[PDB]
């Protein structure tokens, strides 16, 4: 069988140092130069790396330089395979990626050597087998050894990293761009919703993040004259329109009095400037293509999906929310970028994905009057908890 | 025999770049699955760009080169030199939007053409009850495609005035001149309305009377569907209405002597009316729409009243979104009764759902909510 | 593959108009001329329709005249085609059955064409698609727009019903031939169980039908010198005898004082006539074997069934309590009949089949002293509800 | 090698005769199934005609000439001039009772050397402890045949009256003279008794007490067969009920040496008596009624007593019923103790039947009831 | 097919009455001469029944005597057949189990006769079926009535068998070897634990089998200056230990006043003589070496194993307690005799296995203080029943 490796893989990790000295050092990290498959690669990773450890930067001459002095230069192919190897990166940047699969490779090679090695142990070294016993065992734990990957972060950066953490709770405000909810909270925290970015709630059991959602919904929509398109999959237009009346002035079995309360409601949003959708288990791809529509003729300002699970982007098999939820996710911030507005979606609660690696903030709702929200992940700003009143619906 | 609806050129153009961009892949997904491309190899492909993606891993072409390798389908798909051949097929990468769209476009039809020719052979070969054969049949196509604007809220709020308007201050008549009519201008046309009623002793009555009322005292007409009980079963209740006789028969022996003037007159002003039933158990989505549509074409039709692990509770829903189906299709107002033991998918199709002496609350709208 | 059709029933249905004219009305119900598969057979049924349609009655002689106009005559085989057409239906009673199959090959015959036209139209009409999505869509919906059966039976008709059958409730007492309980009930309601009839009392927990129907049993071999049959394939014999003299005549864990008042009832039974058979799970074969046996010698009157449900005459798949205790239904009344006597049959409840199309009256019993017998069906008798009252065990 | 039992001029009188009269098939079905039928067609057809009937459709040769034109095995079974064929083999048609009687006939023949040859085949290469297959085979044979008159009630009254005779004013001999021996007159001749108790403190006392009184004090012979305990557990428990002796031994050490005297006493007179005890955990059936057959041939037979989702309530009652049978098969009064936690079939094949100071009542008969 | 026999296992049984004649009791027990398959094996087997009917003893030339008046000796074969049959005997002892499988091999023969013969019986004979119906019926059930295997051992023997067990249980002491708890109960009652033999202490809920055992454990390792070996796989060395400490002198979540009291008992077991062992799960095997090594270097004296079932000595499929549970218990057996000295196992219930028919003693324990030891089997000595007051640990 051939041997489990990658040559153009390491192609890529190896050129890719070309491109950028930055990419050596995080290959150096995974690899050592011997860890190559073809003996020209590791000559190539040895040499750059004896010749970035004189000093001396590496460009496509210097790493020919030392690699002359050996001259093992007509060996790996001349200058001439160094620049081809800097054309077979795809892209020097995730170098580690490309390094990983080598590490990969090159590490089960051993796997591979290593056993077959005890294979042979096994039909000639019958003379004491509790040696064995103990001896080959030993060998596989030696093969988990060589895997390069992990280093504790140490305690005293995130010492420093809380500190400068509060230190960046420590400024003024200035809202950039987006206005939302009473200011010491995402207003504040976060200069309210910045644009591009995936914002996303956590609820849990009965969703007050419908409520809060559209909260910032209308204010984002009666304060501002930015247009907010809501897609709530969950329910009725009508239904979300009225429930958003008696948020904003003050039942359900009644016979009112102050219709002109009501009035004074739905006069509120005669600014409008909101366009909700319901249509339930909407396609994610409809979520884009409907969403872009408005923003080329009238044009958007943010998105507000009530419910980031009914959306279901559709495909192939389930495999417990996770795998088609992850997709999604990274279907909405592929959105959110080429949208340009911040999106928030709403979850809850019973790693319900990938979610969080795509979220730019991600905030959980928590109480039991008084209700906090707690900001958790804001990439580019702070950490953070904030409270608001909530009484009934406000 | 002919050659299938092939979208290559579209597809390689997608296929190549995904290998451009990483946002070209989300997009292409966006859309469709690798089980829709054509050619072998484009699918095994673009089956392992997302099991790369799915990984967590970036795409660009060395991660699915290599993944590719593994489970060895590289040799299989065309080598990295095919690989390489996609990249170069297209310069920029933004338009695979409407590219890959091409690509889906044409995995339908060869998803219809499929999905018809599978209703052929299954014509000439199995004889199970055209009722149903026919039946799947349209269902099969329905599964097909429908899955593979926004809203004007300052005109929602129009639709939240509207009915303020009924909230204080007719269009398909219901029952007397109470909340009800008032509560939904009529109670009428192409939409579906559901009134639940738990084991409340058979709340069939209030639908009924509304029908009684519909054909004997609008003069428009009618049609019931009781797949439970008998047509006399009822016809003897909607007595029970009119005469109110404390009900029964068998009062005196064959009836009362003396009240058996109400019955000459309570038959007699019902006879009038037109009414149409039928009671077939168990019969409900495809045949109601059969047989009202040929009620419709001959007299002109009338308000409809129907009478009540994973393969149960979404052949419910199936038939709930029929009957709103047949609504529309019949510009027809139909009225279904529901259980109490939710019960599925109702609330979400349905238009004014109603729940149910006593009082009735109403619930979502098409006008004044709850009262 | 060739085409959905039957040929053979066509020509029952044509040929069973010939035999008799009733037939062309429920024909051209369900079907329409060209609705034939065979040419020939569409122009013999048009040709019937438009000569039956001029008013003058349709004979071998009328239907060949009509047909000659046009001259078909030579091309549907001749008058000898048209004959033999009328020797090849097997019985023009059913003629719907034989239409029912025609209506459906061909309906079905359609189904075909369509799809395969959509297919067709699949491979060369790309130019628009979401068109094809709604078209093909409704030529589906359209094929299953043309099977004629179907008619809602008006609300006139069934309230005059509802009325001649009060009318019919309406009259005086004359019991034919059966003689059971409390004259009010089954007796004047419905003559006291005819001949040939298969009767049917549904029960429900704690069988009540058990003692009604061997109260009805020994009333009929007390009163009249009948005798009556009765497998009890529940309880045994002695069990079922004695339960029936404390029932006639006044216990259990008891020294009786009064053992004259139980041979006033042992004595009552001294007339006798009923010969009780209790052999549990009995096969309905042996059911009319052993109970005609006794016709023959002694002589009948009628026969009573203690469960409908445990017979079980065997064979096949037993599917669902439907097919098997259906093909016995049907073998209890094609017994009653060929036993020209009664037969009650008990059943209970937790569409128990398709008893009732085999019943010719079926009871239920209903309360909670009193009790009500509520008799819904009885082909060529009234409706109707009749209490009896009923204590312990009388 | 040679000829099965075939019975085609009989099985086509049936095929037939059902083309002429509805009736004719139920009579058919009355006693047959298709699977009966010998020639591949003649199934076929018998079976295709039941399902239209099934249907509900009526089946005169088109229905049935049309169903088996669906699924497709016209052609297969000899096409409708065969079927035709049938028809004519017939004049008149209802002699089919007798005439399918035949056809059943020849079937149980062919069902009975296919069975019994199974055992043959079976025995030459399982060895899967004998004692199971050659009981197994007993069992096949029995599934063969039984499964494939009325009463005198005049004479029922009769039992009634005999009945009465005892509750007011001996053949097997029981307990001391109390409402036992009268209640059955004796207790006695091959028939099944069950005597149930619930976990009542293990009621063997009253099975084994009277087994002693059989022996003992009546001067028959009894087996009892004790599958829970020892031998020697039970004698020694008899012994208390001898010398009435507060039980146990270690009352004083080996024994209480003023009462030693009891002890012969009562082991004197329980020596002279025949009783018969076997224990062997786990065996009731066959070695059971083996055992009794070879001490009945030998001394003369006693009364025997024995102590103690779908596939174990069905074995209770096989055993159930052989215990029934194999009281008949040898003219012996079998009674068997059962637990209360009903637990079976055991009230049907089960003669007098009772439920168990206190007292105890008396069930289902052949003498008087309960008391 | 090669009709069902073993030749050889009838020259077993044949010539292991040449051996011993104890054999044609037991032979003759279960198999009659005819019974056998090859043909001179039956002459010989009713040459020997008939020479030792006339009273004469069997020998290698009585049986030939016999044999020889009818002239079948040339026929079976010789003198020369008779002696070798003599030595195809593996072990004259268990004769039954080679008789037995000659009565198995041709009783099932004559299981294929009869059923052929029904066969037959059933093409042909189509005369009458029901008479076939009980008549095949019978023919089988007679086949079950030729295993002559069974018989009553009456109750006559089973009386005197009581007597002179409660004779047996009137005896004085002199505990032999062991010497174990209160003298009334093991020591007494028998001798104190033999050598070799299995002893099995039956437990039940809350296990106080293993205070029990390890008070036998210390009694015999205090007392006598045997070396007691005791397997724990249940519980800790060190919780043992201690557990038996407050066992000999008396208290867990404590700060003790007495540790004197607990130096007594610490001090107590300074003879020690007790070598413990706790590693879980021990394969049996290991149970066997180790338990021996100690023998052959300080000398054993008796083991104790903490619960039966954790042995699980490994292998094939477990096959619901009982298989391996059996292999396992008779490989106790066959150590506790290959290492001369008893050994106690403790069990407890929810035919364990088949550890009775191992076993030299069960014993039980019973009660609700007091409680009481109840020993049910004890090849050799009496049955009996003996209390011993409790309390806490003692
Ligand atoms: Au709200
Ligand atoms: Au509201
Ligand atoms: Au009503
Ligand atoms: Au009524
Ligand atoms: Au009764
Ligand atoms: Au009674
Ligand atoms: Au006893
Ligand atoms: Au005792
Ligand atoms: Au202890
Ligand atoms: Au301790």
């Known amino acids: 069988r051939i041997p489990?490796?990658?040559?153009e893989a390491e192609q890529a990790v190896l050129g890719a140092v070309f491109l950028d000295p930055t990419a050596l050092t995080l290959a150096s990290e995974r690899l050592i130069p011997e860890d190559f498959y073809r003996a020209a690669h590791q000559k190539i990773f040895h040499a750059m790396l004896r010749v970035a450890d004189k000093g001396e930067?590496?460009?496509?001459?210097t790493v020919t330089a030392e690699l002359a002095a050996l001259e093992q230069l007509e060996e790996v192919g001349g200058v001439s395979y160094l620049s081809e190897l800097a054309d077979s990166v795809p892209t020097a940047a995730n170098v580690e990626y490309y390094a990983r699969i080598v590490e990969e490779k090159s590490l089960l090679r051993r796997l591979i050597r290593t056993a077959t090695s005890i294979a042979q142990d096994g039909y000639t070294r019958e003379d004491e087998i509790d040696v064995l016993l103990?001896?080959?065992?030993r060998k596989i734990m030696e093969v988990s050894q060589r895997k390069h990957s992990g280093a504790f972060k140490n305690i005293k950066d995130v010492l420093v990293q809380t500190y400068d953490n509060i230190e960046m709770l420590h400024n003024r405000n200035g809202d950039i761009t987006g206005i939302p909810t009473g200011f010491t909270e995402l207003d504040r925290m976060t200069?309210?919703?910045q644009r591009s970015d995936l914002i996303i709630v956590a609820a849990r059991p009965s969703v007050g993040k419908t409520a809060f959602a559209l909260n910032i919904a209308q204010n984002v929509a009666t304060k501002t004259n930015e247009?907010?398109?809501i897609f709530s999959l969950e329910m009725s237009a009508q239904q979300l329109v009225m429930?958003?009346?008696?948020?904003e002035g003050n039942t359900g079995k009644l016979t009112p009095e102050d219709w002109g309360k009501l009035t004074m409601a739905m006069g509120?949003?005669?600014?409008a400037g909101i366009y909700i959708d319901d249509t339930p288990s909407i396609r994610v791809s409809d979520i884009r293509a409907k969403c872009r529509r408005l923003k080329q003729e009238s044009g958007l300002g943010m998105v507000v999906i009530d419910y980031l699970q009914l959306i279901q982007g559709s495909g192939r098999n389930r495999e417990n929310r996770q795998?088609?939820?992850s997709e999604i996710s990274r279907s909405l911030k592929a959105l959110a970028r080429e949208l340009e507005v911040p999106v928030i979606a709403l979850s809850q609660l019973s790693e319900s994905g990938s979610i969080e690696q795509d979220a730019d903030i991600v905030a959980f709702l928590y109480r039991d009057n008084i209700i906090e929200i707690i900001i958790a992940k804001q990439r580019n700003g702070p950490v953070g908890t904030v409270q608001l009143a909530f009484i009934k619906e406000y």
Chains 1, 3, 5 share one sequence.
Do not use: H
């Open 268 to 271: 509120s949003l005669s600014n």
């Open 4 to 7: 489990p490796q990658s040559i």
């Open 227 to 229: 247009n907010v398109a």
């Open 191 to 193: 200069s309210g919703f």
């Open 243 to 247: 429930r958003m009346l008696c948020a």
């Open 57 to 61: 930067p590496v460009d496509l001459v």
């Open 323 to 325: 795998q088609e939820v």
């Open 134 to 137: 103990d001896e080959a065992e």
